[PDB]
Amino acid sequence: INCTRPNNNTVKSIRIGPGQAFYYFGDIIGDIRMAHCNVSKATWNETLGKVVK
Amino acid sequence: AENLWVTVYYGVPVWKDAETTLFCASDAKAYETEKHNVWATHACVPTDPNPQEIHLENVTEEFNMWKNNMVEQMHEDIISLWDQSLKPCVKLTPLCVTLQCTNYAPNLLSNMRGELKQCSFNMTTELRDKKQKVYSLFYRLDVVQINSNKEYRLINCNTSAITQACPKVSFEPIPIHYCAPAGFAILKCKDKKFNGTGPCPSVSTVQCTHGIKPVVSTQLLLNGSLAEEEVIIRSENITNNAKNILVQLNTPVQINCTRPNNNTVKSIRIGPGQAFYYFGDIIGDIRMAHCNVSKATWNETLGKVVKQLRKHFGNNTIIRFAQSSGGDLEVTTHSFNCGGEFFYCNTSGLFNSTWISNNDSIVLPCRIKQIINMWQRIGQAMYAPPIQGVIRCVSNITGLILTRDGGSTNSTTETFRPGGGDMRDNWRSELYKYKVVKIEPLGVAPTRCKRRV
Amino acid sequence: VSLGFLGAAGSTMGAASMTLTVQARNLLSHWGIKQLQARVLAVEHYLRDQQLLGIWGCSGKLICCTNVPWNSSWSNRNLSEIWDNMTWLQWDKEISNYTQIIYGLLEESQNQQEKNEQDLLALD
Amino acid sequence: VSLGFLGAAGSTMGAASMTLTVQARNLLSHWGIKQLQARVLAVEHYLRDQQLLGIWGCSGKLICCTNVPWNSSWSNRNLSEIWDNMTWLQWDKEISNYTQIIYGLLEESQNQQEKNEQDLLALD
Amino acid sequence: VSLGFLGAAGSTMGAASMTLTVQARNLLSHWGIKQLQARVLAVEHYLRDQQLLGIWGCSGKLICCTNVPWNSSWSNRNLSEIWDNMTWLQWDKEISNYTQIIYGLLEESQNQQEKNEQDLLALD
Numbered sequence: 115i116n117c118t119r120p121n122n123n124t125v126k127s128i129r130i131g132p133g134q135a136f137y138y139f140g141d142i143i144g145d146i147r148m149a150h151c152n153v154s155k156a157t158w159n160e161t162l163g164k165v166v167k
Numbered sequence: 168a169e170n171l172w173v174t175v176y177y178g179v180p181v182w183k184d185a186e187t188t189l190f191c192a193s194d195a196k197a198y199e200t201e202k203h204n205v206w207a208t209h210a211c212v213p214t215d216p217n218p219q220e221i222h223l224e225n226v227t228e229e230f231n232m233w234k235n236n237m238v239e240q241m242h243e244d245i246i247s248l249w250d251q252s253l254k255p256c257v258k259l260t261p262l263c264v265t266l267q268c269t270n271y272a273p274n275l276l277s278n279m280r281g282e283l284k285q286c287s288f289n290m291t292t293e294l295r296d297k298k299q300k301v302y303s304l305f306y307r308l309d310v311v312q313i314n315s316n317k318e319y320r321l322i323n324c325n326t327s328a329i330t331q332a333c334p335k336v337s338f339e340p341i342p343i344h345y346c347a348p349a350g351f352a353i354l355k356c357k358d359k360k361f362n363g364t365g366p367c368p369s370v371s372t373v374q375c376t377h378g379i380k381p382v383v384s385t386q387l388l389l390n391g392s393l394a395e396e397e398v399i400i401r402s403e404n405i406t407n408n409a410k411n412i413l414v415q416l417n418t419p420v421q422i423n424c425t426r427p428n429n430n431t432v433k434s435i436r437i438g439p440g441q442a443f444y445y446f447g448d449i450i451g452d453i454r455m456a457h458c459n460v461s462k463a464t465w466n467e468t469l470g471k472v473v474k475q476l477r478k479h480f481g482n483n484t485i486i487r488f489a490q491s492s493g494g495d496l497e498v499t500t501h502s503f504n505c506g507g508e509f510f511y512c513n514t515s516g517l518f519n520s521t522w523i524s525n526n527d528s529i530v531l532p533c534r535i536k537q538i539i540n541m542w543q544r545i546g547q548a549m550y551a552p553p554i555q556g557v558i559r560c561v562s563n564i565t566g567l568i569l570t571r572d573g574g575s576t577n578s579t580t581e582t583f584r585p586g587g588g589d590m591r592d593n594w595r596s597e598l599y600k601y602k603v604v605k606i607e608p609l610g611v612a613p614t615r616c617k618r619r620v
Numbered sequence: 621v622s623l624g625f626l627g628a629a630g631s632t633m634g635a636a637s638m639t640l641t642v643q644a645r646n647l648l649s650h651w652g653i654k655q656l657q658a659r660v661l662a663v664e665h666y667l668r669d670q671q672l673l674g675i676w677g678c679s680g681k682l683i684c685c686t687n688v689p690w691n692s693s694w695s696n697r698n699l700s701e702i703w704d705n706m707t708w709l710q711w712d713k714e715i716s717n718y719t720q721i722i723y724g725l726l727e728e729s730q731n732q733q734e735k736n737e738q739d740l741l742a743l744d
Numbered sequence: 745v746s747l748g749f750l751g752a753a754g755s756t757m758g759a760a761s762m763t764l765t766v767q768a769r770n771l772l773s774h775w776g777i778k779q780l781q782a783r784v785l786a787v788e789h790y791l792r793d794q795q796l797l798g799i800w801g802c803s804g805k806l807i808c809c810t811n812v813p814w815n816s817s818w819s820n821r822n823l824s825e826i827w828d829n830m831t832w833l834q835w836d837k838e839i840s841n842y843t844q845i846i847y848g849l850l851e852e853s854q855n856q857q858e859k860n861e862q863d864l865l866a867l868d
Numbered sequence: 869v870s871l872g873f874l875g876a877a878g879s880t881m882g883a884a885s886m887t888l889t890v891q892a893r894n895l896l897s898h899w900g901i902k903q904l905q906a907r908v909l910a911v912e913h914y915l916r917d918q919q920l921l922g923i924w925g926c927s928g929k930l931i932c933c934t935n936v937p938w939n940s941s942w943s944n945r946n947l948s949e950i951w952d953n954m955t956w957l958q959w960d961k962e963i964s965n966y967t968q969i970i971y972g973l974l975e976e977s978q979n980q981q982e983k984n985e986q987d988l989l990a991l992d
């Protein structure tokens with residue numbers, strides 16, 4: 115299986131204080147494609163036919 | 168008969184070195200006085216009256232400092248000792264609030280024309296819906312502004328938290344022995360001169376060494392164990408300026424250090440149950456903190472050390488001393504502890520001399536802080552409360568650290584200046600002659616004769 | 621006179637061999653866990669070789685003999701000077717790449733044969 | 745050839761009886777407390793039966809005999825097939841409800857009489 | 869009948885001397901650390917004197933004799949009444965300022981001489 119996340123990020127860091135470095139979501143740049151996973155089709159057929167026997 | 172058979176022996180002295188953990192053991196009286204509480208030497212399995220020492224014969228051994236595992240064992244536990252003594256006493260987050268003020272009035276009427284900053288702010292009371300007004304004092308080395316009365320802040324509320332010191336625990340060091348478990352031995356060799364490494368002719372073993380007083384000091388070792396009859400130099404890689412220079416001496420010299428202004432305190436309550444101590448008001452004159460030193464003896468030992476130091480740098484070269492360089496303050500000044508407070512003395516009135524190859528008192532100024540970032544760590548800091556009365560402490564100066572400079576080849580009369588800023592080497596200064604080892608009892612050899620069935 | 625602990629370790633064999641008791645008399649002679657790690661370590665090293673001595677037909681005997689002869693490919697030095705001109709620190713490094721052959725051949729030489737013949741001589 | 749640890753446990757007596765050394769050679773071979781609970785447990789089981797062997801007149805002897813005869817109400821199988829056609833896993837379940845009578849009668853049979861007669865034969 | 873643990877401690881010698889096994893049969897029989905401090909303490913006291921018995925030529929023998937005679941400056945009471953009219957609690961306080969001379973003189977009397985003569989009688 116291959117699984118990716120296209121829209122990576124840029125991040126920022128703000129200080130709660132005293133001494134609590136908080137991290138959070140910054141801004142997105144570029145296109146937007148949601149996360150997904152590919153899988154080999156015919157092999158998934160083959161092992162599913164294998165398990166049902 | 169004239170064939171030989173084998174036999175087995177048990178418990179024959181051989182040793183091959185290793186490393187394990189250790190433990191500590193020291194008391195004769197100090198738990199009985201105790202000031203009800205001390206920094207954590209609490210049970211520690213109190214020591215033996217008469218320690219054991221066996222002289223050895225016809226034995227040599229290679230000896231190397233700078234690779235002993237024992238110095239990091241003394242490094243790791245004191246860190247774990249320090250925070251554990253500091254943690255369960257009371258926290259304070261809500262102090263670093265905005266604040267505005269200007270200086271105190273007879274600050275300009277003293278030798279110390281510096282910084283007192285009579286100051287004030289709002290603080291939460293025991294009840295959550297009530298505030299209160301206070302009035303207090305803070306040195307400029309513990310306050311800094313933001314960029315109207317330009318508002319201030321404590322030094323590193325922008326980095327980490329601050330926790331006040333627990334009001335009954337002392338900071339004065341107690342001598343400690345460090346002792347090895349069974350199946351092990353500690354080796355010390357008792358030569359007078361010892362130039363760091365190499366073999367040593369006369370060795371001996373002891374289960375646990377003499378006492379070490381873990382004092383926290385920079386650029387001058389104080390209350391340290393004294394050397395033998397002649398002054399010595401120690402290093403790694405002289406004529407390679409990256410590391411530091413250690414020197415130990417024989418004639419201890421005095422130092423007296425005081426704090427004149429006894430400056431009584433007050434105490435309010437943060438609440439519930441947070442008895443906060445703060446600086447009250449001062450009455451009397453103002454004289455800043457300082458230290459005296461015997462002049463002619465300081466000339467005498469400095470003339471003593473330069474005769475010894477010349478041998479590692481030729482014959483006809485010129486030696487000049489200088490003050491510290493800069494950067495942070497904590498490598499420049501001479502910092503130490505006395506009576507539960509922390510001084511910072513400029514020490515520029517010592518290393519001001521050149522040297523040609525052929526009843527007075529030096530008064531040096533000192534300053535005090537109230538926020539410490541001890542052990543070169545970032546992530547915590549401690550607040551110390553002031554103490555009433557007049558404090559006064561005497562000690563022996565024993566051991567200074569030195570650092571070379573840049574320059575060129577061996578012609579341009581190289582110089583020196585203090586510095587350092589580390590604490591591990593100070594323990595390397597006083598654990599120089601110890602190493603761990605493990606015995607091995609099992610042995611086997613051929614004998615002449617046989618065994619009955 | 622009592623020379624003391626690790627006393628004649630720089631001396632020769634026959635001086636060191638006659639005084640062996642004192643090595644046993646000293647062998648078992650927040651900050652609670654690190655002390656407690658020491659005592660469990662000290663009891664571990666002592667109890668380990670103890671049965672390893674005890675498996676060799678020598679229970680509490682400090683000095684004891686055995687049955688297996690000496691293979692002369694091990695050393696060639698005959699008898700006298702090894703008791704007279706070396707130290708144990710000189711000795712133990714010299715025979716180091718042998719001991720695994722020694723210990724295994726030692727134990728089965730007595731405590732397989734000498735118990736089976738014991739089970740056959742006390743038989744009849 | 746060395747068969748190894750727990751080797752011939754499926755075999756018969758005489759094969760298993762001849763190789764007994766390797767069971768002793770393997771017997772003593774936040775996450776600090778649970779390791780430390782193991783080593784104090786391992787030293788406890790070893791040291792327990794050790795003196796329980798040592799009280800029986802057998803200090804370090806791996807195989808040893810004794811004095812007390814066999815009460816024939818215990819087993820009836822005579823000599824041969826018990827050494828030739830069973831396993832120790834077969835043996836130990838078979839004689840299980842006897843051992844408390846065995847151990848107490850064993851120890852006083854030697855180590856009361858055989859020391860008192862020792863204190864009377866070495867007497868005169 | 870079995871009198872039990874610490875049974876005849878108020879009795880005399882010969883009653884108490886004949887039953888000595890039961891003192892060994894009972895000798896090794898947040899709240900995890902303080903339990904664990906007990907078991908490491910219990911194993912320490914047992915293992916200490918065990919080798920201190922084992923250094924004296926007595927490995928597992930509960931009762932054993934030795935070689936050194938009695939210096940009559942120690943006691944003067946001859947033989948009979950000390951086995952017949954005192955207790956061990958009476959005995960041990962009576963001979964208390966002697967034992968350090970006793971233990972050191974005991975161990976070298978056998979286990980220096982009696983092994984060196986053993987290394988000379990098994991020699992020839």
Ligand SMILES: *[C@@H]1O[C@H](CO)[C@@H](O[C@@H]2O[C@H](CO)[C@@H](O[C@@H]3O[C@H](CO[C@H]4O[C@H](CO)[C@@H](O)[C@H](O)[C@@H]4O)[C@@H](O)[C@H](O[C@H]4O[C@H](CO)[C@@H](O)[C@H](O)[C@@H]4O)[C@@H]3O)[C@H](O)[C@H]2NC(C)=O)[C@H](O)[C@H]1NC(C)=O
Pocket residue numbers: 202339382389390503504505506559560561562563
């Ligand atoms: C290097 O080595 C020197 C030499 O010891 C050390 O200097 C000593 O440091 C200690 C620690 O502060 C000093 O002790 C202080 O003594 C003051 C004088 O007390 C004397 O008089 C009282 C009676 O009033 C006696 O009971 C006492 O025993 C002394 O004889 C006290 O004022 C101080 O008191 C504080 O503590 C006590 C107890 O906790 C309280 O009752 C007080 O209210 C107050 O809180 C303190 O006891 C000592 O005087 C110093 N000099 C000498 C010669 O010993 C250095 O500390 C050491 N380290 C460094 C880094 O230099």
Ligand SMILES: *[C@@H]1O[C@H](CO)[C@@H](O[C@@H]2O[C@H](CO)[C@@H](O[C@@H]3O[C@H](CO)[C@@H](O)[C@H](O)[C@@H]3O)[C@H](O)[C@H]2NC(C)=O)[C@H](O)[C@H]1NC(C)=O
Pocket residue numbers: 116117118151152
């Ligand atoms: C998983 O499967 C999807 C298909 O559903 C794969 O997506 C394909 O990825 C390629 C590589 O980026 C795309 O091609 C690109 O097209 C642009 C158009 O200008 C071109 O400039 C690029 O150089 C590149 O050739 C393709 O369009 C895209 N197809 C779809 C339907 O999304 C994907 O790569 C697979 N793998 C992973 C790890 O996601």
Ligand SMILES: *[C@@H]1O[C@H](CO)[C@@H](O[C@@H]2O[C@H](CO)[C@@H](O[C@@H]3O[C@H](CO)[C@@H](O)[C@H](O)[C@@H]3O)[C@H](O)[C@H]2NC(C)=O)[C@H](O)[C@H]1NC(C)=O
Pocket residue numbers: 404405406407
């Ligand atoms: C100073 O630091 C180093 C590291 O411990 C040690 O000496 C220095 O080592 C470097 C690197 O090997 C030497 O450079 C050499 O130069 C010659 C040219 O003649 C070259 O052919 C070699 O291949 C190598 O590059 C360097 O000369 C040497 N010395 C100094 C002064 O830098 C030494 O342990 C340290 N201490 C002292 C006192 O030098």
Ligand SMILES: *[C@@H]1O[C@H](CO)[C@@H](O[C@@H]2O[C@H](CO)[C@@H](O)[C@H](O)[C@H]2NC(C)=O)[C@H](O)[C@H]1NC(C)=O
Pocket residue numbers: 121122123124141142143144
């Ligand atoms: C996703 O990752 C890419 C990695 O290349 C980021 O793009 C780079 O950002 C650095 C920041 O200094 C620039 O110097 C480069 O020129 C950028 N490379 C590009 C745009 O190809 C990108 O910013 C990340 N995405 C987000 C939303 O931050």
Ligand SMILES: *[C@@H]1O[C@H](CO)[C@@H](O[C@@H]2O[C@H](CO)[C@@H](O)[C@H](O)[C@H]2NC(C)=O)[C@H](O)[C@H]1NC(C)=O
Pocket residue numbers: 311322323325326
């Ligand atoms: C936290 O406060 C300290 C105050 O010491 C800041 O240190 C200052 O940093 C600026 C940056 O150029 C220097 O110009 C000042 O000289 C520094 N102050 C002093 C007293 O030297 C520090 O930048 C602040 N922030 C962090 C993250 O530490």
Ligand SMILES: *[C@@H]1O[C@H](CO)[C@@H](O[C@@H]2O[C@H](CO)[C@@H](O)[C@H](O)[C@H]2NC(C)=O)[C@H](O)[C@H]1NC(C)=O
Pocket residue numbers: 362363364365
């Ligand atoms: C430490 O002092 C010893 C004692 O002299 C030095 O050892 C010998 O010093 C002489 C001095 O001329 C040399 O000739 C010898 O070669 C030295 N003996 C050796 C190296 O085995 C030693 O050099 C000194 N070491 C340091 C680092 O100062």
Ligand SMILES: *[C@@H]1O[C@H](CO)[C@@H](O[C@@H]2O[C@H](CO)[C@@H](O)[C@H](O)[C@H]2NC(C)=O)[C@H](O)[C@H]1NC(C)=O
Pocket residue numbers: 423424425458459528530
């Ligand atoms: C340290 O040296 C100074 C001298 O600089 C001493 O200060 C003197 O103290 C006496 C006592 O009242 C005064 O009469 C002098 O006027 C002071 N001199 C100066 C220049 O101020 C001081 O006593 C010495 N000792 C200590 C412990 O500080």
Ligand SMILES: *[C@@H]1O[C@H](CO)[C@@H](O[C@@H]2O[C@H](CO)[C@@H](O)[C@H](O)[C@H]2NC(C)=O)[C@H](O)[C@H]1NC(C)=O
Pocket residue numbers: 499500513515
């Ligand atoms: C220690 O005292 C010396 C002596 O005054 C201080 O050196 C002064 O430093 C400033 C700033 O570099 C110079 O303008 C002065 O000329 C220096 N004085 C002299 C006499 O040369 C030094 O700053 C002090 N150190 C500390 C940490 O306070």
Ligand SMILES: *[C@@H]1O[C@H](CO)[C@@H](O)[C@H](O)[C@H]1NC(C)=O
Pocket residue numbers: 115116152153154
């Ligand atoms: C998944 O990615 C790897 C990357 O090397 C590739 O070799 C493989 O063919 C991919 N598989 C699918 C099903 O896309």
Ligand SMILES: *[C@@H]1O[C@H](CO)[C@@H](O)[C@H](O)[C@H]1NC(C)=O
Pocket residue numbers: 159160163
């Ligand atoms: C899987 O492969 C078989 C051939 O073996 C085919 O008959 C079937 O329709 C396939 N099913 C899917 C879901 O691809």
Ligand SMILES: *[C@@H]1O[C@H](CO)[C@@H](O)[C@H](O)[C@H]1NC(C)=O
Pocket residue numbers: 224225630631
């Ligand atoms: C130490 O060495 C000398 C040199 O041979 C030797 O005579 C002596 O017996 C040795 N042992 C000692 C002093 O215990």
Ligand SMILES: *[C@@H]1O[C@H](CO)[C@@H](O)[C@H](O)[C@H]1NC(C)=O
Pocket residue numbers: 265266267287288289
């Ligand atoms: C304290 O709070 C009061 C409430 O209004 C405010 O007027 C005053 O300026 C505050 N003082 C400081 C120093 O923050």
Ligand SMILES: *[C@@H]1O[C@H](CO)[C@@H](O)[C@H](O)[C@H]1NC(C)=O
Pocket residue numbers: 429430431448449450451
């Ligand atoms: C300083 O010490 C004196 C000594 O009697 C004391 O009376 C006074 O209250 C102290 N504090 C001052 C002057 O602020």
Ligand SMILES: *[C@@H]1O[C@H](CO)[C@@H](O)[C@H](O)[C@H]1NC(C)=O
Pocket residue numbers: 421422423459460461561
């Ligand atoms: C330091 O104070 C002590 C206190 O008794 C005194 O004896 C000594 O002379 C003083 N030394 C100097 C240099 O002032």
Ligand SMILES: *[C@@H]1O[C@H](CO)[C@@H](O)[C@H](O)[C@H]1NC(C)=O
Pocket residue numbers: 466467470520
């Ligand atoms: C130190 O004393 C010597 C005399 O031995 C003198 O020549 C020198 O100038 C003095 N130096 C200082 C700094 O007092």
Ligand SMILES: *[C@@H]1O[C@H](CO)[C@@H](O)[C@H](O)[C@H]1NC(C)=O
Pocket residue numbers: 481482
């Ligand atoms: C440098 O001077 C000292 C002082 O006498 C002398 O011992 C040494 O030999 C001199 N150095 C050289 C290289 O001669």
